[PDB]
């Protein structure tokens, strides 16, 4: 305890996306680094750009090692995402805050028994409006998805006025909300 790192329940992989229209969407996805301790998470987070500082068209994705940050993945293709839609004023006040909070929910395993239904999370930096989302494995699991959304919304500290949607990746890859919270 004087010398051992604090282990996480999962190894996590951080990915970076930069739009290059000459490439397949997937080839623009590049692995930054993986980590499986609290200490190693902070070493990585502390040296990388804040989302509010990325060029428009970039993503960060944090996913459980073995799960690619794409809807094609075995663990994603039945799932969906809880989506936070930002306007341009929230990039200033909310984006970086909201995103750190999202990582802490992933790494600290904040959703009880349904944290196992979490695949990862992504932040989209966009000129038109930023987005943050948590991806879950099965859009059918009403209790899992529904529990994650409730706790996520609490964790982001969003008021009863704000309502957020969950969209299945099946619908997206074709968007209606299966659930809102």
């Amino acid at each position: 305890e004087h010398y051992i790192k604090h282990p996480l329940q999962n190894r996590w992989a951080l990915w970076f996306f930069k739009n290059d229209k000459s490439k397949t969407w997937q080839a623009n996805l590049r692995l930054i680094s993986k980590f499986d301790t609290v200490e190693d998470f902070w070493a990585l987070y502390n040296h990388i750009q804040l989302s509010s500082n990325l060029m428009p068209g970039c993503d960060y994705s944090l996913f459980k090692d073995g799960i690619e940050p794409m809807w094609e993945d075995e663990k994603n293709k039945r799932g969906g995402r809880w989506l936070i839609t930002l306007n341009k004023q929230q990039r200033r006040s909310d984006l970086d805050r909201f995103w750190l909070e999202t990582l802490l929910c992933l790494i600290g395993e904040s959703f009880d028994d349904y944290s196992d239904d979490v695949c990862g999370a992504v932040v989209n930096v966009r000129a038109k409006g930023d987005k943050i989302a948590i991806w879950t494995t099965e859009c059918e699991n009403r209790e899992a998805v529904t529990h994650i959304g409730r706790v996520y919304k609490e964790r982001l500290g969003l008021p009863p006025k704000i309502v957020i949607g969950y969209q299945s990746h099946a619908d997206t890859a074709t968007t209606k909300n299966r659930f809102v919270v």
Binding site: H6, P7, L8, Q9, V38, E39, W42, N46, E101, L104, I107, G108, E109, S110, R155
Partner: peptide
């Protein structure tokens, strides 16, 4: 199950 509080994780940042 390994679970960390928000408060513990923030206390680790530096």
């Amino acid at each position: 199950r390994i679970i960390y509080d928000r408060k513990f994780l923030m206390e680790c940042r530096n």
